[PDB]
XYZ file of N, CA and C in Angstrom:
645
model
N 3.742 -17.198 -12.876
C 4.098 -15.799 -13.127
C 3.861 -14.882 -11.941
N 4.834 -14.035 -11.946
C 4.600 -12.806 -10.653
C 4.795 -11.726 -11.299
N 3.931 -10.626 -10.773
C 3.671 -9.141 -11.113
C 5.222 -8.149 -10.974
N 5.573 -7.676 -12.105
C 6.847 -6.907 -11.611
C 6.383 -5.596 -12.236
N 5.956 -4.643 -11.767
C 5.904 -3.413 -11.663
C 6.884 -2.448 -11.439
N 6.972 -1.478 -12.737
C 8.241 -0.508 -13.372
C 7.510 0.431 -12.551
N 8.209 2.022 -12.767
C 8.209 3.158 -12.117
C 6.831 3.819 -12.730
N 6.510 3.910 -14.157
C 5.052 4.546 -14.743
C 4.253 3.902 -13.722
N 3.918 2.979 -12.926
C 2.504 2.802 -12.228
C 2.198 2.951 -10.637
N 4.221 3.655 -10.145
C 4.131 3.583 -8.628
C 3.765 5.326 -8.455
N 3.333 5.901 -9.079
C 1.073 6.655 -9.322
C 0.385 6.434 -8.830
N 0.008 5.571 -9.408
C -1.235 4.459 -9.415
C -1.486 3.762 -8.366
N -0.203 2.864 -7.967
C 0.049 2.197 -6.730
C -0.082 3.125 -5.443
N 0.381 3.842 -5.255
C 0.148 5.238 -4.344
C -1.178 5.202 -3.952
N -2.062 5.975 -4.878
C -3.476 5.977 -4.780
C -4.562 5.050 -4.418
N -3.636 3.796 -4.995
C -4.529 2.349 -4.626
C -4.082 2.217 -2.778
N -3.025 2.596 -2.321
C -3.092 2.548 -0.773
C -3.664 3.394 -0.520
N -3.669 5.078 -0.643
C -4.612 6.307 -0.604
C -5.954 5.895 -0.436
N -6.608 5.041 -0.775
C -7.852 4.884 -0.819
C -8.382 3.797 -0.008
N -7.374 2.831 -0.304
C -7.880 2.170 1.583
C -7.197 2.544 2.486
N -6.804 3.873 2.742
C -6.321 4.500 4.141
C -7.662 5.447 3.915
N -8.104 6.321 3.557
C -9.626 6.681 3.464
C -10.970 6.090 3.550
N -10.416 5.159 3.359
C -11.710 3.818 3.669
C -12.234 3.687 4.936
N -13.231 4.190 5.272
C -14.002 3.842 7.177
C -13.913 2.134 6.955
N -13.573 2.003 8.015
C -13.547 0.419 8.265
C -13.124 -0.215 6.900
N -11.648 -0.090 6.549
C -11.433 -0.787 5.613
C -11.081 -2.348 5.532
N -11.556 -2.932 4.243
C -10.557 -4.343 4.783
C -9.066 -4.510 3.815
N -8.298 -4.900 4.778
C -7.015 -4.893 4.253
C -6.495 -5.931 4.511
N -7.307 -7.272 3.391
C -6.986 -8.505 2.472
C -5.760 -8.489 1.945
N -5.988 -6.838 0.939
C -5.399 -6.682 -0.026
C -4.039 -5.727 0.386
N -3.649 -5.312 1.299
C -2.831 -4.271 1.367
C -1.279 -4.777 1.866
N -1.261 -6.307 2.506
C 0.033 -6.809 2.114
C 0.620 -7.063 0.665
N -0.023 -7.012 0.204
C 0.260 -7.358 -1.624
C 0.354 -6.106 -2.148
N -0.393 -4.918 -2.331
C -0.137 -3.785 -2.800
C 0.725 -2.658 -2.046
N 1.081 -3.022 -1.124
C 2.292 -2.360 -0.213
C 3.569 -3.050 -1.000
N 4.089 -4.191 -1.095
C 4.852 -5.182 -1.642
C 4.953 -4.957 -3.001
N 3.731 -4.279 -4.030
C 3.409 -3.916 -5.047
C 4.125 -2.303 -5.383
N 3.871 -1.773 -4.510
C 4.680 -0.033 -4.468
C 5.974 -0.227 -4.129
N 6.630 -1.089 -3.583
C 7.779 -0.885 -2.996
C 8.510 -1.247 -4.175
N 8.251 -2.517 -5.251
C 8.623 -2.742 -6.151
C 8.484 -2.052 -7.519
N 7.247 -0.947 -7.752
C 7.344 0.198 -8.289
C 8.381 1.280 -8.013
N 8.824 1.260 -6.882
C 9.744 1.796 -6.370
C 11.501 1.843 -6.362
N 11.193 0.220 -7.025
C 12.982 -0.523 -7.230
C 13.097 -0.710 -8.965
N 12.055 -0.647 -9.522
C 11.324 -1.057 -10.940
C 11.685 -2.236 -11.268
N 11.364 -2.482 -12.633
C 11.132 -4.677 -12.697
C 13.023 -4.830 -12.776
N 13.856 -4.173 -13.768
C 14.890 -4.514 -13.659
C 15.777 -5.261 -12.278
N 15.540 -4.120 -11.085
C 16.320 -4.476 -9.999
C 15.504 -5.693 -9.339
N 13.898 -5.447 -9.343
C 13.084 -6.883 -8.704
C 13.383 -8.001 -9.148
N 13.203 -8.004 -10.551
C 13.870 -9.411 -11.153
C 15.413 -9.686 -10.447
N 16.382 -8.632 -10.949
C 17.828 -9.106 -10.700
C 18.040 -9.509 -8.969
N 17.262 -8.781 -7.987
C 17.233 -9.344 -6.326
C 16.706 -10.327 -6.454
N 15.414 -11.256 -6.898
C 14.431 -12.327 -7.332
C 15.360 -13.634 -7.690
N 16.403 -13.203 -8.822
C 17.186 -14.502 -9.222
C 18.283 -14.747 -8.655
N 18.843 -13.731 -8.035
C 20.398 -13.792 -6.804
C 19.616 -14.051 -5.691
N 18.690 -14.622 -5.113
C 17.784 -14.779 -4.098
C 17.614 -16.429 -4.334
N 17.933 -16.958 -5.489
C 17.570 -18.185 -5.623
C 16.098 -18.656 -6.374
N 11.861 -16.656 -11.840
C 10.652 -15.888 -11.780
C 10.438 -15.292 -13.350
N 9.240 -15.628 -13.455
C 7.991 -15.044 -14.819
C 7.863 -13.803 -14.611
N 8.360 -13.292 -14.960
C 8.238 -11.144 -14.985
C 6.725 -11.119 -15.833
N 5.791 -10.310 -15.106
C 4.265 -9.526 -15.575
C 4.390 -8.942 -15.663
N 4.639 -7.871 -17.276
C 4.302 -6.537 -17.332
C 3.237 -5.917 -16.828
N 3.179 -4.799 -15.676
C 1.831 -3.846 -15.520
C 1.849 -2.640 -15.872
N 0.890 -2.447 -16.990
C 0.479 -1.579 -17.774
C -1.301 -1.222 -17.099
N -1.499 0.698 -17.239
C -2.647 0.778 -16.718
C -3.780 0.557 -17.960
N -4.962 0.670 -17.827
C -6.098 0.122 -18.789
C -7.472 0.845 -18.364
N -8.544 0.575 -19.357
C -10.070 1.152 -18.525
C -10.868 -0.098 -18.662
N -11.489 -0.437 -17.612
C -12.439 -1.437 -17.506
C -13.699 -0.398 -16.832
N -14.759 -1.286 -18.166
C -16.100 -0.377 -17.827
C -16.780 -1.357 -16.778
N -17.760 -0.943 -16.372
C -18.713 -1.994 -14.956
C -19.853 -1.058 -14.490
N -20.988 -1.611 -14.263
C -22.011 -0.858 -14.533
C -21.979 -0.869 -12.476
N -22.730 0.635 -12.071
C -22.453 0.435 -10.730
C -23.843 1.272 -10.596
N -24.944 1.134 -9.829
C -26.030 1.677 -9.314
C -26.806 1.594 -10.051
N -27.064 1.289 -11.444
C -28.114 0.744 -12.915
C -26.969 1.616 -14.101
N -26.100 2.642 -13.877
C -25.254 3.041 -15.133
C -23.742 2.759 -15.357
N -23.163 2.364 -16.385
C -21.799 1.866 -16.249
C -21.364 3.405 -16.196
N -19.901 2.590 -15.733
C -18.505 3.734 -14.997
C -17.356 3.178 -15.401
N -16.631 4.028 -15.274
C -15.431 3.778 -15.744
C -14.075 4.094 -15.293
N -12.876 3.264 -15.128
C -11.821 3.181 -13.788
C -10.674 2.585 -14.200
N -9.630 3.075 -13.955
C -8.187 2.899 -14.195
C -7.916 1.681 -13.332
N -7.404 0.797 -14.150
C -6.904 -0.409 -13.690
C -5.365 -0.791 -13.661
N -4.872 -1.609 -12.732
C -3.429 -2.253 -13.133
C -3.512 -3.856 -13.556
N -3.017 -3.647 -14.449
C -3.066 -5.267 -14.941
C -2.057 -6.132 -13.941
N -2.458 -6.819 -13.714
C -2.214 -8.080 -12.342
C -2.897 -9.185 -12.312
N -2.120 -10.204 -12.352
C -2.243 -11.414 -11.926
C -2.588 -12.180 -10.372
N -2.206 -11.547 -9.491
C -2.100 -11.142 -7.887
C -3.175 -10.751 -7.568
N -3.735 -9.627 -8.003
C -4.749 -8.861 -7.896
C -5.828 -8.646 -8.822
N -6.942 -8.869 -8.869
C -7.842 -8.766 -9.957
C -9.131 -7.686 -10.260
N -9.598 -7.150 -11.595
C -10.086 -6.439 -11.584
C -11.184 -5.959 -10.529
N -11.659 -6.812 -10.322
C -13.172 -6.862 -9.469
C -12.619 -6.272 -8.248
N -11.579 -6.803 -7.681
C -10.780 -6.292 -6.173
C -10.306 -5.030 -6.514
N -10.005 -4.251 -7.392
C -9.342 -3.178 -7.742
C -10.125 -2.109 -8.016
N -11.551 -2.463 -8.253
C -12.487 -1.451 -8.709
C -13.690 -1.279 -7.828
N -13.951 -2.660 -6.596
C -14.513 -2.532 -5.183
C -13.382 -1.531 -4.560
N -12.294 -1.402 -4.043
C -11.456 -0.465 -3.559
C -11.861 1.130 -3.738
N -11.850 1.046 -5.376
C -12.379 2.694 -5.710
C -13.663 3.128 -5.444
N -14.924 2.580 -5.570
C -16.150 2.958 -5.304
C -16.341 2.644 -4.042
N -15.970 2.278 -3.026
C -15.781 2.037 -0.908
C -14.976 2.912 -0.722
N -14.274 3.424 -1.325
C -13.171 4.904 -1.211
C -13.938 5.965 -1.609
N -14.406 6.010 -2.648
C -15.201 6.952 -3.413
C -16.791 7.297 -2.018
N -17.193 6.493 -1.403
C -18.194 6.274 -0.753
C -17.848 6.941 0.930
N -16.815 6.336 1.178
C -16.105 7.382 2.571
C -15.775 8.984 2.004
N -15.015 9.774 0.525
C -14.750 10.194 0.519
C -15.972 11.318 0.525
N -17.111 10.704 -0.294
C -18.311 12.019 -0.094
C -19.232 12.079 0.797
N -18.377 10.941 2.370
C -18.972 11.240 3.473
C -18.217 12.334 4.300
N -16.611 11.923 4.036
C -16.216 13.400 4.782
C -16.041 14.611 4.090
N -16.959 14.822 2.869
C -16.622 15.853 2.126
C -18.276 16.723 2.490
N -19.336 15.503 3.448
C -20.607 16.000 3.939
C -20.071 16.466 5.211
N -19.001 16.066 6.306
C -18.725 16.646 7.431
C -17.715 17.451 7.145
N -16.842 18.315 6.335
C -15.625 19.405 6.666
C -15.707 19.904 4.965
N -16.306 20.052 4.100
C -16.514 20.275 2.706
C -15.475 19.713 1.580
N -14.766 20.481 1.393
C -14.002 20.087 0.679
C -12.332 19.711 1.307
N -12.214 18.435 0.962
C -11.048 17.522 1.405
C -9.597 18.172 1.151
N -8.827 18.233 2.300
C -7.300 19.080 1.968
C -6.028 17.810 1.615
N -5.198 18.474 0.744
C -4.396 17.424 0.406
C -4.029 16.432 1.184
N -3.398 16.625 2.342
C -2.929 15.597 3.466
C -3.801 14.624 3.906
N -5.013 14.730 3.612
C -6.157 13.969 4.027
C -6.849 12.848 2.995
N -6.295 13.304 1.567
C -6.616 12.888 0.462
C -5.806 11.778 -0.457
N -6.076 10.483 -0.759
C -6.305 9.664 -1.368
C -5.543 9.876 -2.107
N -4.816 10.903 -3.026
C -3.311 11.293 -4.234
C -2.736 12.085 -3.158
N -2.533 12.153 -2.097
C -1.534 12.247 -1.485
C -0.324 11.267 -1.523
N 0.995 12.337 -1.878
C 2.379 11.162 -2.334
C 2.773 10.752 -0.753
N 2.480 10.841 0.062
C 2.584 9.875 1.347
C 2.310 8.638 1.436
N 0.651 8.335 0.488
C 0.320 7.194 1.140
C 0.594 5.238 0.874
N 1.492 5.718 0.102
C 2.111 4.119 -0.216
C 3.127 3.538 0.535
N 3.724 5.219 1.260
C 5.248 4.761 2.276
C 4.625 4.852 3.840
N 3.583 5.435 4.081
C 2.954 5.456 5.235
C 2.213 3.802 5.670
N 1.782 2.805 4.983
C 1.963 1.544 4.295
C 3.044 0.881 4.319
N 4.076 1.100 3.869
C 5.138 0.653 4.309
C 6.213 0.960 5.516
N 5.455 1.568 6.273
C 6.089 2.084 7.949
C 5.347 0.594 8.439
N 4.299 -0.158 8.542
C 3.975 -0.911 8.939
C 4.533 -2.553 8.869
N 5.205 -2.499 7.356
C 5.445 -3.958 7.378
C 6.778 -3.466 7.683
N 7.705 -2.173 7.784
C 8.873 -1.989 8.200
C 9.288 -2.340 9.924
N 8.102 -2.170 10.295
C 7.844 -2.603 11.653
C 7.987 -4.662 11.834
N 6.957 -5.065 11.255
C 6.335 -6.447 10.566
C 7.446 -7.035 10.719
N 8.591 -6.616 9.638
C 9.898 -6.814 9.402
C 10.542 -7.425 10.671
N 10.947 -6.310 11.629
C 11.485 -5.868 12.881
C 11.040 -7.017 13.757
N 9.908 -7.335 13.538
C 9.318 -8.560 14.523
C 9.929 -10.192 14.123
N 9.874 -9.791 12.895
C 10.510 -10.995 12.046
C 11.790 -11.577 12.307
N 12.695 -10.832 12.253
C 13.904 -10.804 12.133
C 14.743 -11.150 13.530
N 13.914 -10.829 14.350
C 14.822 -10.931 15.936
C 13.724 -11.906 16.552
N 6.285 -14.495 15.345
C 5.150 -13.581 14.595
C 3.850 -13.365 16.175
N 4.533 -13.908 17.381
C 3.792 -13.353 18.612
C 3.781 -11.632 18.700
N 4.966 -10.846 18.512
C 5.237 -9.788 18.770
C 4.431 -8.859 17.192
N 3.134 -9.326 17.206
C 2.356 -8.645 16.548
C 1.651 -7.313 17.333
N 1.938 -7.830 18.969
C 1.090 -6.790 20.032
C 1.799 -5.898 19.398
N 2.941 -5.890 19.749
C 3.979 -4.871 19.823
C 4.231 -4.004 18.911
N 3.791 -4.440 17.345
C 3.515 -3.874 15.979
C 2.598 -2.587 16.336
N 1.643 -3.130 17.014
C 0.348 -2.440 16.901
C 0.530 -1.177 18.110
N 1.028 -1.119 18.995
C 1.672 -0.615 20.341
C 2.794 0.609 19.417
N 3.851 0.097 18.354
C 4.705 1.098 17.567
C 3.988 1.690 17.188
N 2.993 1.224 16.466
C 2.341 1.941 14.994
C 1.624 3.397 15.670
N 0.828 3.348 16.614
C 0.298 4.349 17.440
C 0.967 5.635 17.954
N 2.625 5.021 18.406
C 3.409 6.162 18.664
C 4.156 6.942 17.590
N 4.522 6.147 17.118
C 4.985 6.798 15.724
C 4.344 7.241 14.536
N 3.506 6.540 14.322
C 2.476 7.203 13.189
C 0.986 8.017 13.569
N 1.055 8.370 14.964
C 0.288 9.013 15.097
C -0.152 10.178 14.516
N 0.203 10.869 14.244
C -0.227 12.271 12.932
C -1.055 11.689 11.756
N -0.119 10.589 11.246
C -0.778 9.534 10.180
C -1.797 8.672 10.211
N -1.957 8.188 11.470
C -3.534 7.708 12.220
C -4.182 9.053 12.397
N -3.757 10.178 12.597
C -4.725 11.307 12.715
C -5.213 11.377 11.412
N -4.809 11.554 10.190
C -4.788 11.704 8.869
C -5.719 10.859 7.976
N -5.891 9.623 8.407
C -6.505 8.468 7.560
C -7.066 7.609 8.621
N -8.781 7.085 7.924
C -9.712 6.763 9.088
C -9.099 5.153 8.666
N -8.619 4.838 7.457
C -8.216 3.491 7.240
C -6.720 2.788 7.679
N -6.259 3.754 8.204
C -4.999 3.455 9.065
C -5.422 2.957 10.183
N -5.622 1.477 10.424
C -5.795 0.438 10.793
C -4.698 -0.491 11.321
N -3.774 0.353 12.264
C -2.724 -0.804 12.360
C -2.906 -2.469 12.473
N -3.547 -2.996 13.356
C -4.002 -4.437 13.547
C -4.557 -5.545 11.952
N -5.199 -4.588 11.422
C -5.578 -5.171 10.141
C -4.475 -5.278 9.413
N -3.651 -3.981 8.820
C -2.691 -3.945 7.824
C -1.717 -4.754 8.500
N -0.999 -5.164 9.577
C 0.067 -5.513 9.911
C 0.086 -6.820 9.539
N -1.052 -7.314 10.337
C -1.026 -8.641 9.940
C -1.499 -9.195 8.169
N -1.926 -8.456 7.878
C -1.447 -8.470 6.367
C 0.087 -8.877 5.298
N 0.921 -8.308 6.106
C 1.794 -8.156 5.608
C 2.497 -9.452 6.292
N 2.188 -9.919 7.557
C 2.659 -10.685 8.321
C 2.206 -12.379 7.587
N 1.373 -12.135 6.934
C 0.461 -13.342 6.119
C 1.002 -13.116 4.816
N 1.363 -11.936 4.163
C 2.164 -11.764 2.678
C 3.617 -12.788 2.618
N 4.019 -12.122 3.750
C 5.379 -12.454 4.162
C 5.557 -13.887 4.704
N 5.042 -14.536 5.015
C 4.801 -15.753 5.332
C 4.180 -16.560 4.091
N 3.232 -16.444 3.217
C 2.522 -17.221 1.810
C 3.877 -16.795 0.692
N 4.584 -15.848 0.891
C 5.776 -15.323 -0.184
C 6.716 -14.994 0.837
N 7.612 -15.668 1.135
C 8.954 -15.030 1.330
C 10.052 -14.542 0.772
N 9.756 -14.576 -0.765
C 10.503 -13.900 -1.531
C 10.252 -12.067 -1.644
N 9.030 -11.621 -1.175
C 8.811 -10.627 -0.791
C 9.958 -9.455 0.215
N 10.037 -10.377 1.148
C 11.407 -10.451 2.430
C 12.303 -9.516 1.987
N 12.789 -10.321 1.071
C 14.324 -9.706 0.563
C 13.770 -8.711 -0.646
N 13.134 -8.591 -1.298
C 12.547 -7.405 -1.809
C 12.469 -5.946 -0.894
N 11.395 -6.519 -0.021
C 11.797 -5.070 1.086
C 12.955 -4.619 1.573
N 13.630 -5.948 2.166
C 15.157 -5.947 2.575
C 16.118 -4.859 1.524
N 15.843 -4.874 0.414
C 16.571 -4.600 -0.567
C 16.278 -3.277 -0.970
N 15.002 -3.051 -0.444
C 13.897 -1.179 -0.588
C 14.507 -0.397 0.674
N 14.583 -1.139 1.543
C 14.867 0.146 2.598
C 16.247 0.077 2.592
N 17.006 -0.719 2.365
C 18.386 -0.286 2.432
C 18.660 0.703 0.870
N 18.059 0.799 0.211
C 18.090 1.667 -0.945
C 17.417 2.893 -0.555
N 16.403 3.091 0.093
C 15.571 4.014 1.319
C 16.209 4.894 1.923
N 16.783 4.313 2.776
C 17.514 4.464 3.623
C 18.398 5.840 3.849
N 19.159 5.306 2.192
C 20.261 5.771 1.523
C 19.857 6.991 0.751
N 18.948 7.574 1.503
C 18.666 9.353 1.088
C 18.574 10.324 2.160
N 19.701 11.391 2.445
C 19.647 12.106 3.694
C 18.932 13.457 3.657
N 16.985 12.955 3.169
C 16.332 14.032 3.930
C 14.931 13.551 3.011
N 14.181 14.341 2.406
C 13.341 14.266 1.970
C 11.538 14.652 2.135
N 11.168 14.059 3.084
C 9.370 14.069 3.984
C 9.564 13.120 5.081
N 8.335 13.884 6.298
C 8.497 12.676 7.338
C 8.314 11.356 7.816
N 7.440 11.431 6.608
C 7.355 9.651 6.327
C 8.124 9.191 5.946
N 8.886 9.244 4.483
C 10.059 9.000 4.147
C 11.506 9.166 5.394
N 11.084 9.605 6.220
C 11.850 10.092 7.640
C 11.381 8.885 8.550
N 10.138 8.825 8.909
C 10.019 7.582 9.848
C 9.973 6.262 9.297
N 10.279 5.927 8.028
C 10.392 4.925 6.980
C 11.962 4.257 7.844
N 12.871 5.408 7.679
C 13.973 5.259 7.459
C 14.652 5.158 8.926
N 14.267 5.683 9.876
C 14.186 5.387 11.664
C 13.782 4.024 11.827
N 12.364 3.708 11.585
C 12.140 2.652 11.738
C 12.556 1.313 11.571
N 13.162 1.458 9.624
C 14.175 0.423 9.376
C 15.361 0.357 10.085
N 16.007 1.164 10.214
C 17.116 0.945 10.966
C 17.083 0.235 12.190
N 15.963 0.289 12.661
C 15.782 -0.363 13.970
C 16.006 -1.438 14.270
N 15.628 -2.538 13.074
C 15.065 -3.768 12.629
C 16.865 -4.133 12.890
């Protein structure tokens, strides 16, 4: 079975990149899979499935949930996505290492401004500027320098923005997604040319759409 994620949880999915781009020294294990995870929130299960079987798959409903877990001697409590891919324990370390950077820079500049913040609607496509790059290398896995060399010029505002914007980590993430699943491939393949195909929007959604074209 594989995770096919409808439009109610690409929210959710958002925030789950939001928070390891806020993450000081994040690790991003997990962020080829939940990048791959939004993009398909993004196409919803109908079109993933129908690209999936003209591609040459077990559809997972994800529905959100509360799982309690006791954290410092008192339980807490945290919005989950049900996943097979991804599992609770990985989903709820994410929020409290996010939660932990966030009331460190809320001790250096007080209170946190949207652009900087974790439900910012940027941060799932700012995530996907990277494997749009990933892609680009693919297509024409040495030219990982070169990933990391883009990511700096172009997403610089966005490396200004998030201490977990990590090009070197996330890239090769996606570079290891994309390689263990290549059915992923044509999923993206199939997001940015649907992407693409909107003339205006935000500048991420702007360097989303530069970038693919490149490829």
């Amino acid at each position: 079975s594989i995770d096919t994620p409808n439009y109610d949880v690409q929210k959710h999915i958002n925030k789950l990149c939001g928070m390891l781009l806020i993450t000081e020294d994040a690790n991003h294990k997990f962020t080829g899979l939940i990048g791959m995870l939004y993009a398909m929130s993004r196409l919803g299960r109908e079109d993933t499935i129908k690209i999936l079987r003209d591609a040459g798959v077990k559809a997972n409903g994800v529905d959100v949930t509360t799982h309690r877990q006791d954290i410092n001697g008192k339980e807490m409590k945290f919005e989950v996505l049900t996943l097979a891919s991804l599992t609770t324990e990985i989903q709820i370390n994410i929020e409290i290492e996010s939660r932990k950077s966030y009331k460190k820079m809320l001790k250096e500049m007080g209170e946190v401004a949207p652009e900087y913040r974790h439900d910012s609607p940027d941060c799932g496509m700012i995530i996907l500027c990277i494997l749009a790059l990933v892609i680009t290398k693919l297509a024409a896995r040495s030219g990982l320098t070169a990933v990391i060399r883009r990511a700096n010029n172009v997403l610089k505002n966005e490396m200004k923005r998030y201490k977990g914007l990590l090009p070197k980590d996330i890239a090769n993430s996606f570079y290891e997604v994309f390689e263990k699943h290549p059915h992923f491939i044509d999923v993206f393949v199939h997001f940015g040319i649907a992407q693409s195909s909107t003339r205006g929007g935000s500048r991420v959604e702007g360097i989303f759409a530069g970038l693919f074209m490149n490829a």
